[PDB]
């Protein structure tokens, strides 16, 4: 109920290190695909860690 | 006119967006301000 919302902007985000590292038990993307994340430049990114 | 004040409570309980006009700096400090009843800036005459 106190999920940490962090602002991510004005930086180069390398999602490959997250995707290739199989330490996660659930890496699901809905509006995009995890493999194509390294070719899109995003307007604004929210991180919600909890 | 020297700027505008924004917020929801304006008594240091919550955040407050603030804008001031100046020839050098237009600082937009988003802080927790314990705002006064009459926030005003005086200039000599």
């Amino acid at each position: 109920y106190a999920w940490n919302r962090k602002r991510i902007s004005n930086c180069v985000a390398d999602y490959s290190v997250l995707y290739n590292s199989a330490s996660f038990s659930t890496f699901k993307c809905y509006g995009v695909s995890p493999t194509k994340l390294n070719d899109l430049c995003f307007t604004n990114v929210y991180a919600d860690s909890f | 006119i020297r700027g505008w004040i924004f917020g929801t409570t304006l008594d240091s309980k919550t955040q407050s967006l603030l804008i001031v006009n100046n020839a050098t700096n237009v600082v937009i400090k988003v802080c927790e301000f314990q705002f006064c009843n009459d926030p005003f800036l005086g200039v000599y005459y």
Epitope: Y1, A2, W3, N4, R5, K6, F50 | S12, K13, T14, Q15, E32
Partner: nanobody, 115 residues
Framework: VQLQESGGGLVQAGGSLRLSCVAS????????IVWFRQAPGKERKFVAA??????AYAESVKGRFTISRDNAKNTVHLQMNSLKPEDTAVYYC???????????WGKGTQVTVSS
């Protein structure tokens, strides 16, 4: 940035204690406190919460306590009255800010009471 909970000394049944949860911060008045209870090896529970305008206690401490606020100090304090030997627990205190969800959990204080 953090919270430290100190106190919880050795007292007698029916006595009065003064436990303070001093917070490293600058708007802890907005960060309303919640007190939690854990039995010595049993399931956890809450105690009280002075959420600004009003208060809310637990069934074990219903009205027996005098919860207090130190808004000029950004610290919280609980008054313990009619203490019982069956309330031997480790009280907690926590506050979460409205913006950017986050926790400032403390450490705990013993509530050992003789019978």
């Amino acid at each position: 940035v953090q919270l430290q909970e100190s106190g919880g000394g050795l007292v007698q049944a029916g006595g009065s204690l003064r436990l303070s949860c001093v917070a490293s911060g600058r708007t802890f008045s907005s960060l309303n406190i919640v007190w939690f209870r854990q039995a010595p090896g049993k399931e956890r529970k809450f105690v009280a919460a002075i959420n600004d305008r009003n208060t809310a206690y637990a069934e074990s401490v219903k009205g027996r306590f005098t919860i207090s606020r130190d808004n000029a100090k950004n610290t919280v304090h609980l008054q313990m009255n009619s203490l019982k030997p069956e309330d031997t627990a480790v009280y907690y205190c926590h506050s979460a800010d409205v913006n950017g969800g986050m926790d400032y959990w403390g450490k705990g204080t013993q509530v050992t009471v003789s019978s």
